[PDB]
Write a protein that binds this ligand. Structure first.
Ligand SMILES: Nc1nc2c(ncn2[C@@H]2O[C@H](COP(=O)(O)O[C@H]3[C@@H](O)[C@H](n4ccc(=O)[nH]c4=O)O[C@@H]3CO)[C@H]3CC(O)(O)C[C@H]32)c(=O)[nH]1
Ligand SMILES: [Cl-]
Length: 395
C-alpha cells in the first residue's frame, strides 16, 4: 500500500484532520513529504495531517486564491515569501510564535525571509539552493577543472563544446537561471525601493546567455527538466536547484558531480537563488486544527525529520540540530554532495518578496528571457518591455 493510501486510511480513522496543500507533483519531494506525514500521524492518537496535491507551485497559489474567494482555506499550505506577502494583505496568516512553535536554531538565512514587520509568518520547510551539476567523466576526459569563477565557467563551456561538437552548458530560459547570472554580475532587483528589470547587470546577464546560444556553448532546454533531457547530446554543466539532486543521480549515465557555484573571484563561491517553500497556518482554521499544525510544525523542525527529508531530496536542512543528527551524519559521510549543498547554502540570495512577484517572474521577466533566447529579441529591448509591463502592474 502506497504512503498516500496509508495516509488516507490514517485520516479516515482520525477525529481531527488538518489539510496541508502542497505543490509536489511527484518524485523524491512528494515521497519524502508523504513518509514524514505517515510517521507523524502514527505518533498522534486520532490527530492527523492530510497532504493534498494541488499541482505545481503556481497551481497551488491559484488554488489558495480560489479558496479565499470560496471562503474555505486549508489549515496549512506551502508558500514562497511573495505568496506570504500576498496572504498578509488579506490578514489570512497566524503568527507562528503565537502557536508556541520554537524557532531558535532555524538558519537565519531562512528565518529572516519569513519575518514581515518583525513577525514570523512561516516555518522554513523545503528550502533549496542552486548548485553546479556537472559531468565528472566529460571534464576528466578533456582535462578541464571544475570552474571556480564565471570567467572559468565560460572558458570551460567553450573548450568542451568545441571538443564534443555540441553546446555543453544546458539551461532553462527562465527567471531562476537568469537570477544566477544577474546576482553574480552585481545585479540587484531593488534600487531605492523600486523594482528594476532592465538594469545594465540584467542586460549583461541575458546577453551572456543569448551570446552562449549563438556561439554554440549554451543549449536551451524547452521540453522538460534538464535532468529529463540527459542522453541527448553531450552535457557538461547546469545551474539547477539542489531539490533536483535525486532526479539527476537517477537519470545520469555518467559520473555526476556537484560543486559550489562559480563566483566573480576565487575568494568566495557564487550566490545561488534560494527556492522551495515555507509552511503557513491559516487564521480561519479551528483551534483543534491549529493544535495539530503546532505539533506537525515542531515535528518538521526536529533534527530527525529534517535529516531524513533533506537526505532523500537535496533540500538544505533548515536547523543547526539537523546537521548534528546521526542519520544526516551517516549520509554525509558516504556522499560529499550533501556537505557541498550546505556549503553553497551559506552564499544565498532571494528574489523580491513583493506580493505581485509570482506574476512578474513568470509572465513578464520569464517571457522577456524566452523572447531573447528563443525568438532572437534584443536583450535590452526585451527587458525594456518587461520593465514597462512590471511598472504598469505595480501601479
Ligand atoms: N510558483 C512559484 N514558483 C517559484 C517561485 N520562485 C521560484 N519558483 C519555482 O521554484 C522551482 C524550484 O523549486 P524547488 O522546490 O527548489 O524544486 C522543485 C522542482 O524544481 C524540483 N524538480 C522536480 C522534478 C525534476 O525533474 N527536477 C526537479 O528539479 O523538485 C521540487 C518540487 O517540484 C523553480 C522551477 C519553476 O517552476 O520553473 C520556477 C521555479 C515563486 O515565487 N512562485
Ligand atoms: Cl561571490
Amino acid at each position: 500500500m502506497k504512503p498516500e493510501d496509508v495516509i488516507k486510511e490514517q485520516c479516515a480513522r482520525a477525529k481531527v484532520v488538518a489539510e496541508l496543500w502542497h505543490g509536489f507533483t511527484g518524485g523524491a519531494p512528494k515521497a519524502a513529504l508523504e513518509n514524514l506525514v505517515v510517521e507523524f500521524n502514527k505518533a498522534q492518537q486520532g490527530r492527523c495531517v492530510r497532504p493534498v496535491p494541488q499541482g505545481g507551485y503556481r497551481d497551488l497559489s491559484t488554488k489558495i486564491k480560489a479558496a479565499f474567494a470560496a471562503g474555505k482555506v486549508p489549515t496549512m499550505a506551502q508558500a514562497f515569501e511573495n505568496n506570504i506577502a500576498l496572504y498578509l494583505e488579506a490578514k489570512a496568516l497566524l503568527p507562528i510564535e503565537s502557536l508556541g512553535v520554537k524557532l531558535q536554531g532555524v538558519n537565519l538565512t531562512f528565518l529572516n525571509a519569513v519575518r514581515f514587520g518583525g513577525v514570523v509568518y512561516g516555518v522554513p520547510f523545503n528550502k533549496s539552493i542552486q548548485v553546479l551539476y556537472y559531468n565528472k567523466d566529460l571534464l576528466k576526459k578533456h582535462g578541464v577543472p571544475v570552474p571556480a569563477t564565471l570567467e572559468e565557467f565560460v572558458a570551460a563551456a567553450k573548450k568542451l563544446s568545441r571538443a564534443e561538437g555540441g553546446p555543453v552548458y544546458w539551461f532553462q530560459p527562465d527567471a531562476s537561471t537568469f537570477a544566477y547570472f544577474f546576482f553574480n554580475l552585481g545585479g540587484s532587483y531593488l534600487k531605492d525601493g523600486k523594482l528594476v528589470l532592465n538594469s545594465k547587470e540584467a542586460v549583461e546577464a541575458l546577453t551572456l546567455l543569448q551570446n552562449g546560444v549563438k556561439e554554440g556553448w549554451a543549449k536551451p532546454i524547452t521540453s522538460g527538466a534538464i535532468n529529463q533531457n540527459l542522453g541527448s547530446g553531450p552535457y557538461a554543466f547546469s545551474v539547477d536547484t539542489s531539490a533536483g539532486y535525486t532526479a539527476y543521480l537517477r537519470a545520469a549515465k555518467f559520473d555526476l558531480g556537484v560543486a559550489t557555484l562559480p563566483g566573480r573571484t576565487k575568494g568566495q563561491p557564487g550566490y545561488g537563488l534560494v527556492q522551495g517553500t515555507n509552511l503557513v497556518v491559516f487564521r480561519q482554521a479551528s483551534k483543534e486544527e491549529q493544535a495539530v499544525a503546532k505539533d506537525f510544525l515542531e515535528f518538521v523542525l526536529s533534527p530527525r525529520a529534517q535529516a531524513v527529508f533533506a537526505t532523500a531530496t537535496g533540500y538544505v536542512p533548515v536547523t543547526e540540530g539537523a546537521l548534528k543528527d546521526p542519520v544526516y551524519q551517516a549520509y554525509a559521510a558516504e556522499n560529499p554532495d550533501y556537505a557541498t549543498i550546505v556549503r553553497q547554502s551559506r552564499y544565498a540570495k532571494f528574489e523580491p518578496a513583493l506580493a505581485e512577484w509570482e506574476q512578474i517572474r513568470f509572465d513578464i521577466l520569464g517571457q522577456a528571457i524566452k523572447e531573447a533566447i528563443l525568438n532572437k529579441a534584443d536583450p535590452k529591448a526585451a527587458l525594456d518591455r518587461a520593465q514597462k509591463l512590471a511598472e504598469d502592474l505595480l501601479s
